[PDB]
Amino acid sequence: MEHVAFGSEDIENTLAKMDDGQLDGLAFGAIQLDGDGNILQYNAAEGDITGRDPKQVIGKNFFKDVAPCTDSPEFYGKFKEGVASGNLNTMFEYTFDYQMTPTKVKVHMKKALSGDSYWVFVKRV
């Protein structure tokens, strides 16, 4: 178990040191995306929420392929503006509903310390 709290103010510093098998110890879902929304990392806790096998989603586009209910101004729209701006730190609730039981979650999106990477953190509410 890796001790990190959802929403912590220096979470990107914390996760920088972590390997993929370390990300799997987090109490919340964590996805790492490039600027184009392609999944670079995907932890086990997100797999528990969405039903995806984490290995099978790496390389796919989060907005186009994997999570199409996120393709909207309220989610994808924010990300695309954070990528354009190169700054992003936003937290909001959303309902995941694509090919799964509708589940209400808290999403936190934040820029990584990495130069062109972005985090999406997901926990149940």
Ligand SMILES: *C(=O)/C=C\c1ccc(O)cc1
């Ligand atoms: C809407 O599509 C949000 C999330 C999501 C993530 C994974 C899967 O498989 C479905 C939906």
